[PDB]
Amino acid sequence: SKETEVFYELAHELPLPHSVSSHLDKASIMRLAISFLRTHKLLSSVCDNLYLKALEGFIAVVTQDGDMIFLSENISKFMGLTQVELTGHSIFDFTHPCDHEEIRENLTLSTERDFFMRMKCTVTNRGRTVNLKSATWKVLHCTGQVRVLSCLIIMCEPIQHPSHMDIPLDSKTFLSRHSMDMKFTYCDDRILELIGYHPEELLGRSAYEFYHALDSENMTKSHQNLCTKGQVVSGQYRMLAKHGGYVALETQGTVIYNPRNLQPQCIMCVNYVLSEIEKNDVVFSMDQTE
Amino acid sequence: ERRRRNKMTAYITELSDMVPTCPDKLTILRMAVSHMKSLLTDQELKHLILEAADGFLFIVSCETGRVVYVSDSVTPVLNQPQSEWFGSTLYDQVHPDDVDKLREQLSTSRRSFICRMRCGTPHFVVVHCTGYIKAWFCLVAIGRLQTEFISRHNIEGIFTFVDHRCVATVGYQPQELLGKNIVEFCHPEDQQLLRDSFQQVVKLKGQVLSVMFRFRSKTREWLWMRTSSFTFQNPYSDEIEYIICTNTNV
Numbered sequence: 001s002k003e004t005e006v007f008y009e010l011a012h013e014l015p016l017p018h019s020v021s022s023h024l025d026k027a028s029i030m031r032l033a034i035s036f037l038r039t040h041k042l043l044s045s046v047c048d049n050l051y052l053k054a055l056e057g058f059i060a061v062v063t064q065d066g067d068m069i070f071l072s073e074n075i076s077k078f079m080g081l082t083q084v085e086l087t088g089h090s091i092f093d094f095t096h097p098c099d100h101e102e103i104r105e106n107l108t109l110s111t112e113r114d115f116f117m118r119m120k121c122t123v124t125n126r127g128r129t130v131n132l133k134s135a136t137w138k139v140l141h142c143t144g145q146v147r148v149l150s151c152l153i154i155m156c157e158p159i160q161h162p163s164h165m166d167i168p169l170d171s172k173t174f175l176s177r178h179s180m181d182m183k184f185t186y187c188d189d190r191i192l193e194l195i196g197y198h199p200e201e202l203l204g205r206s207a208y209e210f211y212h213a214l215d216s217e218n219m220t221k222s223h224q225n226l227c228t229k230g231q232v233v234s235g236q237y238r239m240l241a242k243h244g245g246y247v248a249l250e251t252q253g254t255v256i257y258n259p260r261n262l263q264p265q266c267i268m269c270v271n272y273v274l275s276e277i278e279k280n281d282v283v284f285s286m287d288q289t290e
Numbered sequence: 291e292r293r294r295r296n297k298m299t300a301y302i303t304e305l306s307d308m309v310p311t312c313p314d315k316l317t318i319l320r321m322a323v324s325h326m327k328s329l330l331t332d333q334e335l336k337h338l339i340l341e342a343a344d345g346f347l348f349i350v351s352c353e354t355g356r357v358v359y360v361s362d363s364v365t366p367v368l369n370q371p372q373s374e375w376f377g378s379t380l381y382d383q384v385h386p387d388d389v390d391k392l393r394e395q396l397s398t399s400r401r402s403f404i405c406r407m408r409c410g411t412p413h414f415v416v417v418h419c420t421g422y423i424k425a426w427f428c429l430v431a432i433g434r435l436q437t438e439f440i441s442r443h444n445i446e447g448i449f450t451f452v453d454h455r456c457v458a459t460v461g462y463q464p465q466e467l468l469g470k471n472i473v474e475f476c477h478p479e480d481q482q483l484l485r486d487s488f489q490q491v492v493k494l495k496g497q498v499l500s501v502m503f504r505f506r507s508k509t510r511e512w513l514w515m516r517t518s519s520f521t522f523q524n525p526y527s528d529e530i531e532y533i534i535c536t537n538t539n540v
């Protein structure tokens with residue numbers, strides 16, 4: 001009796017709604033309390049519905065042995081799992097095992113970090129929610145710093161699935177569809193006005209034909225990442241425009257699987273042009289001569 | 291269970307190790323209570339974004355583009371006074387060619403897009419912006435931050451890509467090399483050598499071989515020139531995409 005009192009005390013003195021703080025078992029009150037203290041601790045070393053709502057991802061801080069000592073509130077809006085559920089638990093218990101090693105390397109030891117990691121997701125496309133066994137894997141783009149006992153402070157953005165777009169799109173982005181040999185099976189039609197290519201010309205051409213050579217290596221790794229994990233965001237890179245010169249693009253890509261066959265059909269690319277044509281004096285390629 | 295209690299104890303120990311004023315269970319349960327009663331913070335979430343994403347927040351009227359607000363994080367992110375930004379227009383802070391894109395994102399939901407902003411103490415950095423439209427209209431957004439020349443050939447030796455530096459290395463415009471066989475620029479006596487190199491890098495697929503040969507400049511003079519080079523294969527099909535070459539004026 002006399003401890004149940006002080007457990008409800010601590011709970012309602014956690015930074016929580018009276019609502020959610022009532023419901024906690026004691027192991028959770030331990031976890032959350034400890035994570036809160038740990039977290040405050042890291043904060044001293046470093047130094048809302050707006051920021052939270054304007055983010056397209058969640059913030060998380062993970063110790064070097066993998067403990068997830070803080071997860072921003074809105075994580076549920078993207079993974080379905082909640083701050084109360086996961087706080088204090090290992091990142092490795094909620095990520096794809098074939099990513100665990102990469103995660104390990106990124107928790108460890110320049111301070112900048114950027115990778116992709118598959119994490120369990122229990123919210124469904126459009127609204128609904130499932131149970132932890134019915135969990136899908138979702139790829140997250142993680143960028144932050146490792147920092148000093150060591151922590152990893154990252155922002156994790158889901159990569160919007162191109163079939164399911166909550167988010168609108170401007171004139172300066174266009175879609176493209178590729179064979180798994182990265183050929184052009186379909187391309188949007190603003191590609192002309194933005195770069196000058198007609199879709200016909202591109203089809204059955206390997207995207208490698210249009211990379212600035214200085215990019216190609218970077219691009220292949222992105223591709224390999226895309227195939228290991230299922231989504232990816234490229235770094236920025238320049239596509240050879242048609243009449244000489246080039247443009248700064250940045251593409252996010254998705255393999256799409258055959259839902260009946262269960263094999264993968266192709267790759268959907270959403271392509272963000274970041275510039276006009278640059279250096280159209282210069283002809284880099286054979287295409288830009290004709 | 292047995293370890294159930296053991297991990298509740300490991301929690302308790304962990305607590306006592308983190309509460310500096312800090313005994314038994316009831317006590318640490320209550321010393322924690324008072325020690326947090328002393329003390330996520332609002333303005334600190336900001337520092338979290340700054341540290342993690344290198345992002346700063348700003349709110350701009352939709353109708354005009356007026357900066358109704360900018361968080362001071364703008365100065366670590368963009369090397370900008372808060373004064374330089376606040377009370378201004380978003381079109382003022384972006385690349386001129388990003389003006390149009392920008393207009394579309396501010397018409398009468400979520401918003402997400404990319405754009406070059408100005409920094410300084412005329413240079414631009416690329417900026418990912420996310421956020422949403424609230425009434426007042428306005429946009430609540432976060433902006434975070436992110437000797438030789440090189441040639442590609444088909445397996446025949448046809449230039450299919452050169453960087454502008456060929457002009458400085460051999461005198462030619464890129465157009466005067468593109469479409470032609472590198473062997474056509476090779477001195478007779480060396481052409482077999484060049485071709486041996488080209489049969490070899492393809493057979494020794496993947497690896498870098500290097501070869502030296504004379505190269506007629508735009509002015510006809512023979513230029514000794516070392517090209518290390520290697521095949522590039524498609525990651526999926528392993529088909530030879532092309533040969534990559536780095537042609538260094540020896």
Ligand SMILES: CS(=O)(=O)c1ccc(Oc2cc(F)cc(C#N)c2)c2c1[C@H](O)C(F)(F)C2
Pocket residue numbers: 175176177178179180181182183207209210211212219222223226232233234238239240249251252253254267268269271
């Ligand atoms: C997903 S990704 O890495 O970012 C990517 C980007 C552009 C990709 O091809 C493109 C699409 C585009 F609109 C302009 C260019 C160029 N240059 C290349 C591809 C990928 C995939 O490999 C792929 F295999 F689908 C092919």
